């Protein structure tokens, strides 16, 4: 699954993304 | 691991829960029922 972490659009429009139990070397800054 | 089936981890680790029980246990050995 892919999850999106947001502080709320009434605070900011930045976003972070969690790729669930995926090794972070095969996803396709801060990794 | 499988086909469309996954297992999500719990939010509190086992280390955190053992920390919680040692705080309860040190509160009761030392203050009785006053800390609750
Ligand atoms: C939501 O927006 C309103 C007005 O734009 C503001 O008063 C309120 O503090 C905002 N809420 C948060 C959690 O920032
Ligand atoms: C992801 O793959 C690399 C390459 O084998 C490995 O070193 C790494 O440990 C893997 N990720 C995890 C969380 O083990």
Q: What would you say this structure looks like, in words?
A:
It is classed as viral protein. This is part of a larger assembly, with two copies of chain A. By secondary structure, chain A is an all-beta fold. In chain A, 0% of the residues lie in helices and 26% in strands. The first copy, chain A, has strands spanning 2-5, 16-19. Chain A has a two-stranded antiparallel ribbon with strand order 1-2. Chain A is elongated. The two termini of chain A are 17 Å apart. The chains hardly touch. One 2-acetamido-2-deoxy-beta-D-glucopyranose binds at residues 10-11 of chain A.
List keywords for this structure.
31 residues; mainly beta; part of a larger assembly; 2 chains; two-stranded antiparallel ribbon; Spike protein S2' (chain B); 0% helix
Structural topology:
This is part of a larger assembly, with two copies of chain A.
Chain A (H helix, E strand, L loop, with lengths): L1 E4 L10 E4 L12
Antiparallel strand pairs in A: 1-2
The complex binds 2-acetamido-2-deoxy-beta-D-glucopyranose (2 copies).
PDB class: viral protein
Keywords: S protein, SARS-CoV-2, viral protein
Entry title: S protein of SARS-CoV-2 in complex with GW01
Oligomeric state, counting identical vs distinct chains: part of a larger assembly
Helix and strand pattern of chain A? EE
- Our estimate of the beta-strand percent of chain A is 25-35%
Secondary structure: helix percent of chain A: under 10%
Radius of gyration of chain A: 11 Å
Quickly count the helices of chain A: 0
Which small-molecule ligands are present, each listed once?
Answer: 2-acetamido-2-deoxy-beta-D-glucopyranose
The span between the termini of chain A is 17 Å
- Per the principal axes of the C-alpha atoms, what is the gross shape of chain A? elongated
Taking the sheet with the most strands of chain A, its summary is: 2 strands, antiparallel
Q: Strand order of the main beta sheet of chain A, please?
A: 1-2
Class by helix and strand content of chain A?
Answer: mainly beta
Secondary structure: number of strands of chain A: 2
């Amino acid at each position: 699954g892919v999850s999106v972490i947001t502080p709320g659009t009434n605070t900011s429009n930045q976003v972070a993304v969690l790729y669930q139990d995926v090794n972070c070397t095969e996803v396709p800054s801060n990794v | 691991k499988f086909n469309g089936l996954t297992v999500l981890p719990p939010l509190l680790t086992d280390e955190m829960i053992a920390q919680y029980t040692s705080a309860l246990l040190a509160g009761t050995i030392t203050s009785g029922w006053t800390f609750g």
